[PDB]
Amino acid sequence: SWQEKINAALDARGAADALRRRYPVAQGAGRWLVADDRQYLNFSSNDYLGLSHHPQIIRAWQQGAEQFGIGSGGSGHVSGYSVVHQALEEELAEWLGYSRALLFISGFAANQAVIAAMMAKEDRIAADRLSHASLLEAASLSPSQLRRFAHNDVTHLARLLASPCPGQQMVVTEGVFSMDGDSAPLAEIQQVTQQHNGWLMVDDAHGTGVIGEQGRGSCWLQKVKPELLVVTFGKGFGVSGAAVLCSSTVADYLLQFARHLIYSTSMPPAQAQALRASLAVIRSDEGDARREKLAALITRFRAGVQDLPFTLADSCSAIQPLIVGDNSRALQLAEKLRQQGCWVTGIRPPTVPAGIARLRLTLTAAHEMQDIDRLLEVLHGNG
């Protein structure tokens, strides 16, 4: 029956331990986290540049409501395509060096929309084994064939691409990977993709706004232009939403065949104004100051772990894995940190293999050096 199907599934998830439970917060973005009315240093949010609380972005969101009301009133294909949406798209395309940008209500929707629209049963997706679930889920449901290459292994990628394919091939990777914060070798990946006549799709959720000139992200920094670039605004941008960057004809195509685009309500124009505001901060001298402050905090953090009984990742970004090893020690550590006013998130098997449990820390430009020093002190020992 249905209920038994439900029940058994929750039971298998329990047995694998794997149970998830949301905790409500009064504040969850930026330097602080407030839970159960207690203040904590927040090392668990994706607000990498501290923009969620930025007064210019807050005011754009507020004035945009005065000017446009709240809901757009419809899809972008009927009465919901605002002059603010259009301006935001044009400013994103110009920023990142593409012909067109298309807005989406979430990065998860944009990824899923692109793949559903572009990939046919004859085609192949070659995706990094560690790609975001939205990408892999979508690639899996797709009628097209899905092959994974070992993480960042371009030799393995070239072999996948070289295998006979009845249709077209799309390579997919991240500019900065979600789990370990490492970067993909985009220039070599792009070379072998072109060698096999494929196209490249890069998801730069963790790179966008945070690295490269004017924060343009991983592709710009590495002087690669993939055919498809997906940027999401729920992280560094400090808001929510996403864009697909692409050529004129691919944009026209998505406008015809991406159903998330055709049959979904567009975002509130006041959300779009906050995103334009966010983009303007990111591109500005203050954007540069925030990125350099983030880099300074990361340096301070990685230096201080050198004396600690833990290990770091190959990450130069806001994502800073602290590898602990054992799942009980990792859980203990995070619980001790919490008692001591530092809110962290532990990642343990099975999400990661056997003996690699960890805290996945995230730093932000809203933090201060004394916050890193407090984290380091508690990691050391004191309470």
Ligand X SMILES: *Cc1c(COP(=O)(O)O)cnc(C)c1O
Rounded-to-integer distance, Cα 194 and Cα 145, Å: 19
Q: 20 labelled as ligand-binding? A: yes
- The yes or no reply on residue 234 touching ligand X (CB under 6 A) is yes
Q: Tell me which stretch binds ligand X (CB under 6 A): 116-124, 184-192, 203-211, 351-359.
A: 203-211
We find the least distance from the C-beta atom of residue 107 to ligand X, in angstroms, to be 3
Number of residues that bind ligand X (CB under 6 A): 14
Give the residue among 317, 260, 294, 307 at the shortest CA–CA distance from 369. 294
Catalytic amino acids?
46, 132, 174, 178, 203, 206, 235
- The yes or no reply on residue 112 touching ligand X (CB under 6 A) is no
We find the least distance from the C-beta atom of residue 264 to ligand X, in angstroms, to be 13
Give the residue among 326, 342, 328, 327 at the shortest CA–CA distance from 377. 342
Give alpha helix (H) positions in 196-284: 218-222, 248-257, 259-262, 269-282
Residue matched to tokens 């990094």: 128
Q: For the window 51-90, what string marks contact with ligand X as x by the rule CB under 6 A?
A: ----------------------------------------
Output the six-digit token pair for 348: 């343990």
Q: What is the DSSP string of 155-219?
A: HHHHHHHHS--SS-EEEEEESB-TTT-PBP-HHHHHHHHHHTT-EEEEE-TTTTTTSSGGG--HH
Q: The sheet that has 342-343: what strands, in order across it?
A: 32-35, 38-42, 342-343
Which of 85, 100, 124, 132 binds ligand X (CB under 6 A)? It is 132
- The yes or no reply on residue 278 touching ligand X (CB under 6 A) is no
Cβ closer to ligand X: 202 or 372? 202
We find the least distance from the C-beta atom of residue 17 to ligand X, in angstroms, to be 23
Q: Tell me which stretch binds ligand X (CB under 6 A): 34-42, 198-206, 248-256, 265-273.
A: 198-206
Q: 107 labelled as ligand-binding? A: yes
Size (the chain), residues: 383
Indicate the helix (H) or strand (E) that contains 360.
Answer: strand 357-362
- The yes or no reply on residue 178 touching ligand X (CB under 6 A) is yes
Tell me which residues touch ligand X (CB under 6 A). 106-108, 111, 132, 134, 174, 178, 203, 205-206, 232, 234, 242
Annotated binding site for substrate: 20, 132, 351
